Design a protein around this nucleic acid. Structure first.
Lengths: 156, 156
DNA sequence: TGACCAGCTGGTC
DNA sequence: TGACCAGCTGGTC
């Protein structure tokens, strides 16, 4: 074993407390799919993830659905979307507003909200390309951070 | 904001410490790709991650490469592999041994090691199907936890 | 930019 | 079991 293991065990009970808090709010694993980050976004905005959901999508008090995305700006400048983008995937996205959280490693920096109308620009681009390519799935096209900051409404 | 934000605020400094420890050992984000669990496996085994690596791969003091996988036994009983399994991916996997970490939530239970010879049973099953099926990719075929326990060497 | 490449897993009958 | 059904992202130019 490595020497740092002693530090790990010392921090552990606190990490378990975090996992417990996450469980209390519908998140089963803080170590996958940005789980530990999703929790922070939910408590700041007041949104909720329901049991039986399909991924990182949430609802507010009035029942409105939202798609949540996170980026680490210390590494990249474009938000990931789907590793197999096509019209069926886009169809799931079209009607709901998106919530974009910006992170500096682990420190939350800002949160933006974009409406479907502010995103049609990209849906049209991807759809237009999918056809041209002979119906080839697009491997993870990106949405630029600058675009989000310029067209969206800052809520944090 | 939810009243529980206050508790998150209390736990935060400890969470940042854990991310700092992970960063020192080559892990950029503890909340994705099982990063926070991977750190634990590395500290127990003494393995290290290679800068500019491809996935959760590590090496020992002699330069031997390993493939590391993790599973949450409370939720599921089959280890994930690759979302688009094919002969190209199988070629990579064939040369190295695999380390399998078993977890009950975030509590580590055991770690087993399988050699290329021990996995060949599955490699042939997959490769045959790919050739038979008309060269179509297999969507995340699983390796049962029972198989790992019965053909593996317990390391922890 | 955008366009090309790549990684980590849970759930079901 | 096997064979399906799905999710979350980073990285280079």
């Amino acid at each position: 074993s490595h020497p740092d293991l002693n530090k790990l065990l010392e921090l552990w009970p606190h990490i378990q407390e975090y996992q417990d808090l996450a469980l209390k709010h519908g998140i089963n694993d803080i170590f996958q799919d940005n789980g530990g980050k999703l929790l922070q976004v939910l408590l700041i905005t007041g949104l909720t993830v329901l049991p039986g959901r399909a991924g990182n999508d949430a609802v507010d008090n009035a029942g409105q659905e939202y798609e949540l995305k996170s980026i680490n700006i210390d590494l990249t400048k474009g938000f990931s979307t789907h590793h197999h983008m096509n019209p069926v995937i886009i169809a799931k996205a079209r009607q709901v507003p998106w919530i974009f959280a910006i992170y500096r490693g682990i420190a939350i920096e800002a949160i933006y909200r974009l409406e479907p109308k502010d995103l049609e620009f990209y849906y049209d681009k991807w759809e237009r390309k999918w056809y041209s390519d002979g119906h080839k799935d697009i491997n993870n096209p990106k949405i630029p951070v600058k675009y989000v900051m310029e067209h969206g409404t800052k809520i944090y």
